[PDB]
Design a protein around this ligand. Structure first.
Ligand code: FMN
Ligand code: SF4
Ligand code: SF4
Ligand code: SF4
Ligand code: SF4
Ligand code: FES
Ligand code: FES
Ligand code: MG
Lengths: 230, 217, 62, 42, 431, 59
């Protein structure tokens, strides 16, 4: 049966196996995330979803930690805010200054979560990392200096598209996502990696540089290319 | 400290999917013995031993060898590439006959490990990551090799040469290039991790079976 | 440039309830088409499923 | 006697010593358990 | 009460230094493979109780009750195989005890694997040995072959009706794959990156089956504890810190070595007795790292009166770790040594998770600037803050272990950093 | 600091500075800037249309 957990002191009944992130979603709080996608598996590596339990001295990964009976989740606590600020500091410390020339532009999760949960200043006084750009076909443009190594494309590729040609080569700070060979990621479901990439590492090549998210008007229609009716 | 080695593959005449590589029948027997050390339905667990065997046979790991291993184990070539690039004992680039790996971590750095490295560089006339012109020696720096108490030490084709001095390492290099195989082990007169001055423990004969056996046990 | 002749092109109104929006449209006299809200269904996420002993959910990479 | 190093058998090993020993041990092994499928991709 | 001066009759790891025969005959000359059938007949619960009474704690880093872990794995079967994984990826910079055990007491290791497998109800034992130890792995395989031929392992092991297999898995060079979950991932033929907890390895381990990861020294001392009591093992050491320990003394010491002693021997007596003391004498000692790179450093003041013990070193803002004692004398660059350790952690980082990846690279760069003084005193607190941001926010303990040496250096040698910065500022402003 | 007629600058090499990021268009209070961009022949992110209405600009 349902177990009772507490989010900021508010009681909520959740099924066993529910994670902290899903419990907060039920109570109406959206914990920040970079690697967690509800349609993909759980990775737990970006470390952006760390939250504080009231009596636990260690922060837990909300996207991968199942809730226990009588757990109080402090989403807006000082430890949670400091953890978010530190993780955002690391990500932006290694990220490049490409926002004006980046198609992600005003619809970037790194920008929005930096503005909402991260600090407004940089303590990084060293040199940044530059990564060679790969080529995976005429549809997806890869500028991999902007990759945050969140492994969404790898998990999507394998699980959803049944294609296992994406992965991480090397280790440490020099870990790179790619094919390791000149192989085109050509599939009928290839633009979804453009969608799910939280940063501008993977972007649409036909749409490149044409517009910005705030200018466009959104019209909700359906698809006529096939009989699925997407 | 940048590694200096790329993690991307550019096809070359010497390294391409058409490069000839295939296991010998003895290596196929070894592979079939390795594969059945793991539960059925988990053949992917043999990727590391099979890649190690391929490297031992060939001297290094070409992309064709990686593809052959992937085909043999029915695992994705991308997964094989991930393993090969992650693990540092796999040579994705041709190396010399002898691969000197000098430990340069702090327990060895406290003793004169820089002296050993400098002596090796002077003896061979190469830098810290290059290869001799005759394709005989390659020299690299490595992290802890697990022989800290015998620092400084080097590893040459899975052979530990410990308690080294510049003269000792020069002698080892000369013996290797002559054709002989130097005896691995400490070069300071010690046989093992025991203290150099003398045995401060285990000075008496070991007790036989059933020395302090519990009453019931 | 992009010209227009429709005064109500940029007019978007915000309502807290579908009933409130319907009442406003009815009292103002415009026709209306209502689209029901679509909320994502609950999903069972489990990190331990990535290492299943006999199931296909096992991941080949991390 | 406690003055001679008895671990001298390792100045004979070759490239394939470990794998040859693994091959020899194959006879003494026991049947491995099965997952019911040939691979997670099946 | 005082501790130290362990007797050879009580030393568990006989044949250390390899002065006797390591074969099956040599091990059987000692107490190895004695009444193992009787131990197996006594069975799992008795062995677990014996271990709990002996109070053995983990010898491969974090000190956890081995009895508690094996009791965690003592749950009833649910139709899945059971595995004991013996960790022998001795990548810690300062540790050689596992190498010595494997190379000189392989039959002790095999008997311990069998006893632990019986205690946990495990069908198989995978000994994951690092790839650089080729000769050690070959000796281990020879010992396993001798045991199989003698019938000590296999089907009806020791004539007790318990089937048990022992395999050896040679890894590649990965200090991260030394970690338990990364060890499990590397055995499964993957990259070898640590998992998240839950699920714990006692519930979902290698191949998705219940597995227990145990250290070479722990499993090797298990059968000696079983044959003997465990009141004896508890008698050796303090109340909650019991047994004997292998210490690897290295660095600026007269006689670097590996020795076995009591679990609460004072550090000063250990150094002055089993290693000949510091090269320039005890008054020339500068710092000691008691547990390898993972544990912080302590100055001479702390080292003067401190016991090589878990709780004793915890109260000294340190940790016992792997009992690897690195000694640094007054004539060394402590900043450069810690920077080299941080560079080691940078190279030996799996790169999976953002805090350790980015922060360890950042700390490496900061320390590289520090060793030459090309910095400002306001950056020391920034380095402390980023180290605190790395610690506790990572998947595995490598990220925590990469920040503790930095914290220790900042806490005990901040004047050195500030003086070097002042010297660099004077040198550059003279232009 | 005086603000008068508008101008588009160049780098010392002669390449245009504008990268078609539309921040000026987004921040213009009077909506006097119209920008349309596409990749150049060499793949650069450059503008094709950059109009300013000086009867709508408030300077
Ligand atoms: C040889 C060896 C190397 C280890 N390396 C690491 C490491 O790099 N990082 C880490 O977090 N833990 C490391 N550990 C600790 C393991 O994660 C785990 O705590 C240990 O293997 C369990 O053994 P124990 O119960 O005997 O302590 C290592 C342990 C051993 C034995
Ligand atoms: S991915 Fe996001 S943060 Fe990075 S350059 Fe593009 S817009 Fe900026
Ligand atoms: S390319 Fe994008 S989706 Fe893939 S790991 Fe990098 S940031 Fe994530
Ligand atoms: S802390 Fe470092 S070594 Fe451990 S999982 Fe994270 S990236 Fe890997
Ligand atoms: S679009 Fe506007 S703000 Fe952006 S670079 Fe061009 S002139 Fe500057
Ligand atoms: S969202 Fe949980 S660690 Fe990434
Ligand atoms: S530090 Fe060099 S062998 Fe360990
Ligand atoms: Mg995108």
């Amino acid at each position: 049966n349902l177990i009772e957990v507490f989010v900021d002191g508010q009681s909520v009944m959740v099924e066993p196996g529910t994670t902290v992130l899903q419990a907060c979603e039920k109570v109406g709080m959206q914990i920040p995330r970079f690697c967690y996608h509800e349609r993909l598996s759980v990775a737990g590596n970006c470390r952006m979803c760390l939250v504080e339990i009231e009596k636990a001295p260690k922060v837990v990964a909300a996207c991968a930690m199942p809730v226990m009976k009588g757990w109080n989740i402090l989403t807006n606590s000082e430890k949670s805010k400091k953890a978010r600020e530190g993780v955002m500091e690391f990500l932006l410390a290694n990220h490049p200054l490409d926002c004006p020339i980046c198609d992600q532009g005003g619809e970037c999760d790194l920008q929005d979560q930096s503005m909402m949960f991260g600090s407004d200043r940089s303590r990084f006084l060293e040199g940044k990392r530059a990564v060679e750009d790969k080529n995976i076909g005429p549809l997806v443009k890869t500028i991999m200096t902007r990759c945050i190594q969140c492994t969404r494309c790898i998990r999507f590729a394998s699980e959803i598209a049944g294609v296992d040609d994406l992965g991480t080569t090397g280790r440490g700070n020099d870990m790179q996502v790619g094919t390791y060979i000149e192989k085109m990621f050509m599939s009928e479901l290839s633009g979804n990696i453009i969608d799910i990439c939280p940063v501008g590492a993977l972007t649409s090549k036909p749409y490149a540089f044409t517009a910005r998210p705030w200018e466009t008007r959104k019209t909700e229609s359906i698809d006529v290319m096939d009989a699925v009716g997407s | 400290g940048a590694g200096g080695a790329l993690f991307v593959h550019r096809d070359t005449p010497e390294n391409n999917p058409d490069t000839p590589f295939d296991f010998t029948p003895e290596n196929y027997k070894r592979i079939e013995a390795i594969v059945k050390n793991y539960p059925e339905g988990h053949k992917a667990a043999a990727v590391l031993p099979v890649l190690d065997l391929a490297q031992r046979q060939n001297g290094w790991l070409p992309i064709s060898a990686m593809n052959k291993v992937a085909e043999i184990l029915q695992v994705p070539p991308m997964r094989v590439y991930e393993v090969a690039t992650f693990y540092t004992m796999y040579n994705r680039k041709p190396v010399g006959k002898y691969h000197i790996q000098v430990c340069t971590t702090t327990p060895c750095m406290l003793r004169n490990s820089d002296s050993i490295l400098e002596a090796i560089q002077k003896k061979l006339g190469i830098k810290v990551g290059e290869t001799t012109p005759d394709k005989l020696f390659t020299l690299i720096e490595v992290e802890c090799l697990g022989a800290c108490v015998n620092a400084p030490m080097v590893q040459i084709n899975d052979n530990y040469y410990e308690d080294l001095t510049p003269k000792d390492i020069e002698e080892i290099i000369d013996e290797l290039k002559a054709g002989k195989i130097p005896k691995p082990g400490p070069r300071s007169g010690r046989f093992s991790c025991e203290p150099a001055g003398g045995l401060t423990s285990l000075t008496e004969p070991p007790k036989g079976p059933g020395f302090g056996v519990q009453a019931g046990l | 440039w992009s010209s227009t002749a429709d005064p109500l092109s940029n007019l978007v109104l915000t309502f807290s309830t579908k009933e409130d929006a319907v009442a406003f449209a009815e009292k103002n006299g415009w026709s209306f088409d209502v689209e029901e809200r679509k909320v994502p269904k609950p999903k069972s996420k489990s990190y331990g499923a990535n290492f299943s002993w006999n199931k296909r959910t096992r991941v080949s990479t991390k | 006697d406690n003055s001679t190093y008895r671990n001298l058998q390792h100045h004979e090993y070759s490239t394939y010593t470990f794998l040859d020993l693994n091959v020899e041990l194959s006879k003494f092994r026991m049947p491995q358990p099965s997952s019911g499928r040939q691979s997670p991709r099946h | 009460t005082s501790f130290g001066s362990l007797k050879d009759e009580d030393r568990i790891f006989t044949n250390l230094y390899g002065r006797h025969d390591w074969r099956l005959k040599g091990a059987q000359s000692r107490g190895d493979w004695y009444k193992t059938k009787e131990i197996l007949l006594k069975g799992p619960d008795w062995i677990l109780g014996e271990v709990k009474t002996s109070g053995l704690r983990g010898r491969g880093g974090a000190g956890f009750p081995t009895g508690l872990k094996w009791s965690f794995m003592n749950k009833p079967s649910d139709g899945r195989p059971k595995y004991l994984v013996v960790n022998a990826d001795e990548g810690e910079p300062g540790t050689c005890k596992d190498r010595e055990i494997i190379r000189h007491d392989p039959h002790k290791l095999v008997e311990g694997c069998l006893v632990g497998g019986r205690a946990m109800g495990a069908r198989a034992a995978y000994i994951y040995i690092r790839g650089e130890f080729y000769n050690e792995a070959s000796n281990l395989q020879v010992a396993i072959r001798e045991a199989y031929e003698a019938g000590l392992i296999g089907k009806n092991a020791c004539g007790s009706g318990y089937d048990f297999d022992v395999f050896v898995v040679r890894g590649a060079g990965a200090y991260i794959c030394g970690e338990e979950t990364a060890l499990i991932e590397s055995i499964e033929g993957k990259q070898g990156k640590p998992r998240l907890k839950p699920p714990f390895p006692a519930d979902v381990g290698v191949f998705g089956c219940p597995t227990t990861v145990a250290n070479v020294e722990t499993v090797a001392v298990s059968p000696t504890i079983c044959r003997r009591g465990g009141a004896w093992f508890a008698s050796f050491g303090r109340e909650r810190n019991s047994g004997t320990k292998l210490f690897n003394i290295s660095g600026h010491v007269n006689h670097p070595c590996t020795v076995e002693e009591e679990m609460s021997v004072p550090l000063k007596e250990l150094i002055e007795k089993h290693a000949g003391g510091v090269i320039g004498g005890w008054d020339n000692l500068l710092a000691v790292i008691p547990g390898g790179s993972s544990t912080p450093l302590i100055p001479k003041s702390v080292c003067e009166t401190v016991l090589m013990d878990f709780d004793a070193l915890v109260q000294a803002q340190t940790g016992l770790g792997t009992a690897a004692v690195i000694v640094m004398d007054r004539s060394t660059d402590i900043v450069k040594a810690i920077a080299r350790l941080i560079e080691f952690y940078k190279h030996e980082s799996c790169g999976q998770c953002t805090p350790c990846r980015e922060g360890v690279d950042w700390m490496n760069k900061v320390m590289a600037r520090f060793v030459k003084g090309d910095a400002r005193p306001a950056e020391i607190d920034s380095l402390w803050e980023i180290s605190k941001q790395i610690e506790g926010h990572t998947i595995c303990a490598l990220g925590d272990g990469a920040a503790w040496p930095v914290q220790g250096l900042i806490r005990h040698f901040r004047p050195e950093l500030e003086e070097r910065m002042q010297q660099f500022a004077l040198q550059h402003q003279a232009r | 600091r005086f603000r008068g007629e508008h101008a588009l600058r160049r780098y010392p090499s002669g390449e245009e500075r504008c990268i078609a990021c539309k921040l000026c268009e987004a921040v213009c209070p009077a909506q006097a800037i119209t920008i349309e961009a596409e990749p150049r022949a060499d793949g650069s992110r450059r503008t094709t249309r950059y109009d300013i209405d000086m009867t709508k600009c408030i300077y």
